[PDB]
């Protein structure tokens, strides 16, 4: 009982996910605009039967889902494609008008493999304050892969109980190094890996690695007791600068 451009919602989402082809989302705040945009994009959906499923989504009720398509919050109408298989997101520029011509070119590019998957990132923080350096996807290379510095990097999730138990100690470690004679050469850093796409393949949280100066292709994964004392030892034993 459903039209070519269906409705993406609580009842329909799992079938869209199990269909095994990508899903294009037409976000609009009102049903009227949803219908207008559906009519404009229908010939694209028609041409892509069996290759991409298209659907409308209620941006009033489900606006927060735009973020999970690496779209910007609260800028509608909006369009994006989700490659379910590879978990990749292809947002369409929300400063641009959604038209038949623009979306057709975007979709053709997608099918042709001509668009690079978007990268999820928090923004670069304006100021670097607090003794633990905040890493996001956009500054990972610059901070973590800085070949002149021994970089301790914690990959964490905010919903994780273990990460919460580590936080105060990891902070105390950062404050210690920031006041030490090693403040020039040791970096103590953290990254919310659920809010940033990072290169590392993380199996569970928290994970801590050392990326030593001059050996950035051989990070060392930490597997000790997670005490401040044991982390200092780890840094001194595995870092280029033997910094403790």
From Swiss-Prot:
Could you name the active-site residues?
Answer: 160, 163
The positions annotated as site (Contributes to redox potential value) read 161-162
Show which residues form the site (Lowers pKa of C-terminal Cys of second active site).
226
Top-level taxon of the source organism: Eukaryota
Span of domain Thioredoxin: 110-240
Q: Which residues pair up as cystines?
A: 160-163
Tell me where in or outside the cell this protein is found.
Endoplasmic reticulum lumen
Q: What does this protein do?
A: Participates in the folding of proteins containing disulfide bonds, may be involved in glycosylation, prolyl hydroxylation and triglyceride transfer.
What family is this? Belongs to the protein disulfide isomerase family.
Protein name from the UniProt record: Protein disulfide-isomerase
* Native organism: Humicola insolens (Soft-rot fungus)
